[PDB]
Design a protein around this ligand. Structure first.
Ligand SMILES: C[C@@H]1O[C@@H](O)[C@@H](O)[C@H](O)[C@@H]1O
Lengths: 87, 87, 87
């Protein structure tokens, strides 16, 4: 099992992405109890990074399934496929 | 063997966590030489995130051993278990 | 295959390091297209972190091959081997 961890803002919020059994899932902290996030994509490996637009977060998750990495983007309303490509 | 890397401030301070077998250890830089960190917990995989509130550093390390992830927290006065649970 | 992701700024800039087949390579975004970076070193595992000194980015990439981790540094004028050791 493999994880990635990010955080932002004043609280801060934290997100932890976990890859296990070719599934990546997301656990979330926003100042209170941890909960399960909306992120669900395939992969055996995961990295993530984020930045702020004021108080709004932008997240990029790099989900590797085998020999291919797909970027997934959170920009405030849902996860979308990003433009990232590898070599 | 696997690592996670974090940094903060302008110097900067850097921490590098290494999972080797089922042990995670920590190497530190605060502007002079690399030194040995106090973090020692179990895991075959590690991720980490950090932030400064003013001058106060806060670190969260996600230590995964098999299918279980434990959060360890540094907030200026020792490492303690965080509330994180996985799926 | 395994990745590490960093970002900085508000645009943002993003770098994704991919360890694939005992090599680590880099893909880059600074606001328009993804392009291939100059980073290329051995490794089966990778982590990275970065900071800004004024407007100048500094990156550290921790490349692990087997039981050895090597630090690679970007400070505005090529990648250089860093002083990091695990012990
Ligand atoms: C920042 C967002 O926070 C919650 O809405 C999660 O359900 C999303 O997946 C994302 O992490």
């Amino acid at each position: 099992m493999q994880t990635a961890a990010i955080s932002w803002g004043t609280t801060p919020s934290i997100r932890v992405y976990t890859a296990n059994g070719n599934k990546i899932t997301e656990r979330c902290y926003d100042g209170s109890n941890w909960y399960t996030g909306a992120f669900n994509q395939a992969g055996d490996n995961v990295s993530a990074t984020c930045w702020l637009s004021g108080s709004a977060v932008h997240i990029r998750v790099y989900a590797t399934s085998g020999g291919s990495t797909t970027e997934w983007c959170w920009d405030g309303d849902g996860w979308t496929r990003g433009a990232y490509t590898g070599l």
